[PDB]
Structures are given as C-alpha cells and as structure tokens.
Design a binder for this molecule. Structure first.
Ligand SMILES: [Cu+2]
Length: 118
C-alpha cells in the first residue's frame, strides 16, 4: 500500500503509472529527487486530482507551491522538495473510486501547441 516516486532534471518520473491495491485503507507516496531539478524549476511535488480537474488545478496554481490554498480538487499532495530532499504523503483511499491523474505542479509546459514547417 505504498510506492516510491522519483523525478529528475529531464522531467521524467521513475514511473508514470501507479496501481492501488484494493485492500488498502490508506496509501502512501514516497517522493525523492536525488539529482538536480530541471533547469529553472525550483521545486518538485506530487499532486493527485481527477483527470478533468488537473488542468484547472494547474491554471489556478499559477494564478494563485504552485497550488491554490485549500483547493478542493486536490485529493493529495506532497510538499515542494528540492534536489536531494524527500517527502511522503499518505491519504485515505476511500476518497477514490477511477482514472485519476498525478502530476508535479512546479514544472509547467505549454497547454496549447502545434507544428510549423517550411
Ligand atoms: Cu506556469
């Protein structure tokens, strides 16, 4: 009923998929970032929400640890960790049901994009 998640300076997760065994009443995410943060990203966290609400959470974090205080869409999140730092978050699995998304709120990319060629 637990997992170790890691990020790096290439904006990669050690895994982009997490399974929660149904015997679990609580689940714990263990976050660490042993190497450097990505360039000009000064923090790393792990955030859980619905697939629908993810974008809202992200936009509102930049509008207001890159997260809106007491955001009701955020199921669970770690604090912002630096390089070489570590944090854990444990949450009640009862608040879940089903295709949820987890993300880091500190490293942003362009939401809207396309291709151009000559
Ligand atoms: Cu941003």
């Amino acid at each position: 009923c637990s997992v170790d998640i890691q990020g790096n300076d290439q904006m990669q997760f050690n895994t982009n998929a997490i399974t929660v065994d149904k015997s679990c009443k609580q689940f714990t995410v263990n976050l660490s970032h042993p190497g450097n943060l990505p360039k000009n990203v000064m923090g790393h966290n792990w955030v859980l929400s619905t697939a629908a609400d993810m974008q809202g959470v992200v936009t509102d974090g930049m509008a207001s640890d890159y997260l809106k205080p007491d955001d009701s869409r955020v199921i669970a999140h770690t604090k912002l960790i630096g390089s070489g730092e570590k944090d854990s978050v444990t949450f009640d699995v009862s608040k879940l049901k089903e295709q949820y998304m987890f993300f880091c709120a500190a490293a942003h990319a362009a939401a809207m994009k396309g291709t151009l060629t000559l």
